[PDB]
Amino acid sequence: ASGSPTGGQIVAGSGSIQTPSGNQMNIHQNSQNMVANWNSFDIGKGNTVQFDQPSSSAVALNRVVGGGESQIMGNLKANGQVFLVNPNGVLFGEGASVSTSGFVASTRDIKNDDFMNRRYTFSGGQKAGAAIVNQGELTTNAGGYIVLAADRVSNSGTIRTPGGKTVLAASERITLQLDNGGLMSVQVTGDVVNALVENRGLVSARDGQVYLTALGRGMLMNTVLNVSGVVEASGMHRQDGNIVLDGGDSGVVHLSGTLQADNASGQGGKVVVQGKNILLDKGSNITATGGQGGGEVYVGGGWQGKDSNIRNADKVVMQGGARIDVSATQQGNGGTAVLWSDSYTNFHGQIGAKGGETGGNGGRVETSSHGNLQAFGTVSASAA
């Protein structure tokens, strides 16, 4: 645990490093893509690391080749984009602030040549027990992205990617395709033992998208994806989903917090919750309401499990006191809410799909299973 990154050297691209003076380290970048290796990459409280980059779409890769888990307690700022790779993991402290146009923290490595060719695929080299934990504040400029990729990813603080994307991913491999400085798409493949993505804090991608994906192996009923806080992607409805949870083909996806994709001045967003076993616990709240129309919430599959782009669950359990709301609030039709499984759907919660107060028809709700169905909750899908 040091106060500032040390042992830095530019090994690809063109740039310069200045050690701390006045509690701030300055890293200047000349090329569009730059690689710096670091003995360590810690930032103490009250200290800043400032990247001065040629373009908001420039990328600096920072690889820790020393031994310690990165301790980021102070500030990291950049006008462009920053990748931080540490096989031993990263902790962002309660006071930490990271503010960039796009930020990746990964325990999986990337090859220098791939990165300098703008082929952003990360895999291999992680140490056993390495996690990425955020207890501070990670934020990007509008349209940027934040990607945290490790065997275990935990957010108890705040992540904000307005008009952009947040991706928390526990997988063996992750590939980022960037388009004009924005995150165009993400592919995650390969299972990881004890894979875990947990959000006790706040993830907010206003007018953006949040994607949480954990791929474990042989969990039985160990949790792979746990959201006890708030995931919010209010704004324009997106066909590919405003909030997408994917627990893979093993383990439990547990929601006790809130997934929020509302749109007071339009149609509600789309929330997709996938996994093998999904538990919507008491107090959980999935809301995709819209002033001009309700949104779509799919838990365990699409309508009757016939959406190839949504994984079909084996079991879905919605506890009493859990709620889903796809209502239209002002004018327009209620949205669509689906609980689906292949083997067992136990519905004890509340699903709302009302039409607008000033007009509109009730929405469409399905609580079903290819196998066993226990439907004991409440569904309100009526006009006002």
Residue numbers in the entry: -3 to 380
From the paper:
One such adhesin, EtpA, is a 177 kDa or 1767 residues, secreted protein that bridges the tips of ETEC flagella to host epithelial glycans including human A blood group to promote bacterial adhesion, intestinal colonization and toxin delivery. EtpA is exported through a Gram-negative, two-partner secretion system (TPSS, type Vb) comprised of the secreted EtpA passenger (TpsA) protein and EtpB (TpsB) transporter that is integrated into the outer bacterial membrane. TpsA proteins share a conserved, N-terminal TPS domain followed by an extensive C-terminal domain with divergent sequence repeats. Outer membrane TspB proteins recognise the N-terminal TPS domain of their cognate TpsA to initiate exoprotein translocation across the outer membrane with simultaneous folding nucleated by the N-terminus.
The crystal structure of EtpA67-447 solved at 1.76 Å resolution revealed a right-handed parallel β-helix with two extra-helical hairpins and an N-terminal β-strand cap. The asymmetric unit of the EtpA67-447 crystals contained four symmetrically independent but equivalent monomers. Each monomer forms a triangular, right-handed β-helix of 13 turns (or rungs), where each turn consists of two or, more commonly, three roughly coplanar β-strands. Strands from adjacent turns align to create the parallel β-sheets PB1, PB2 and PB3 with 13, 11 and 14 β-strands, respectively. While β-strands β1 and β2 (red) form part of PB1 and PB2, they align antiparallel to the otherwise parallel β-sheets and serve to cap the β-helix. The loop connecting β-strands β9 and β10 is a type 1 β-turn and harbours a conserved NPNG motif critical for TpsA protein folding. The interior of the β-helix is dominated by hydrophobic, aliphatic residues, especially valine. Two loops connecting physically adjoining β-strands β12-β14 and β19-β22, are extended to create an extra helical domain consisting of α-helix α1 and β-strands β13, and β20 and β21, respectively. The extra-β-helical secondary structure elements all pack onto the outer face of β-sheet PB1 broadly alligned (anti-) parallel to its β-strands. Despite low sequence identities of EtpA67-447 with the other TPS domains (34% for HMW1-PP, 35% for HxuA, 27% for FHA30, and 23% for HpmA265), the domains all form analogous right-handed β-helices with tightly packed, hydrophobic cores and characteristic aromatic clusters in the first helical turn (W34, F47, F79, F88 and F99 in EtpA).
